[PDB]
Protein: Cyclin-dependent kinase 2
Organism: Homo sapiens
Amino acid sequence: MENFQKVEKIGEGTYGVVYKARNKLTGEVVALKKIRLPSTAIREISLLKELNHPNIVKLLDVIHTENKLYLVFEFLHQDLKKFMDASALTGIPLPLIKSYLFQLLQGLAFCHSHRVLHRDLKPQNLLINTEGAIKLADFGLARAFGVVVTLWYRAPEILLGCKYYSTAVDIWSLGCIFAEMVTRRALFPGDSEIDQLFRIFRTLGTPDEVVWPGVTSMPDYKPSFPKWARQDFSKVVPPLDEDGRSLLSQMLHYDPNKRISAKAALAHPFFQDVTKPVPHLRL
């Protein structure tokens, strides 16, 4: 490429393919995303170059040349999906899960404070380094770009066809990730939209107007949905302690309005004893 050298493919993302690349000018190694194909998107994604935080993957540049769009991001060597796969025999140690959740909530709290949502959080867009940091990639892209991608972290309001999003969608996705770090299994591994919704309903109970006022008027709500009873979190995420289960409960409320904010979640007793351990990362 004119301005970069292509080191290797790191992976397919929602809005396009990602390469590890070297900047010719500087020698720095970056993650270069080629957007799969809009003047709207360019100014809105360009605003994200100013959205800098220790727990957000830094958008270094937006490159619009030859009628193609590339996003240049800071490079990190591993994602949480790979790290959880690598950790599956022992599990991620609790103090590191706690550290990772705490840092991800700080990144969300920052983005949400700037009125930026993610909307598609998943383990593949959570990047880790050797220093014990975790960072969120791809904040703000879903709003700017619009429309087999994983459903597993999709808040129920999205699955029920609500055409508007709130900060709560990101808390829901993070709660699902928290559960999966603890149990070493995805919480809701749906392989279709209705399977996703019904896996949620089978665990949390079918929602109703008592726990979620307004649910029965959402666009894809059907009165014919089966009525499942709600399971105890003690069954769902053993052996997480009552602090962890209380926080997870709050992140997985049905009503987006009842779901804990990132800000409030940082103050939860679960994080009384948070620390920042060194992960064992084989690269």
User: Anything to note?
Assistant: Strands lie at 4-13, 16-23, 29-34, 59-65, 68-74, 78-79, 126-128, 134-136. The first strand starts at residue 4 and ends at 13.
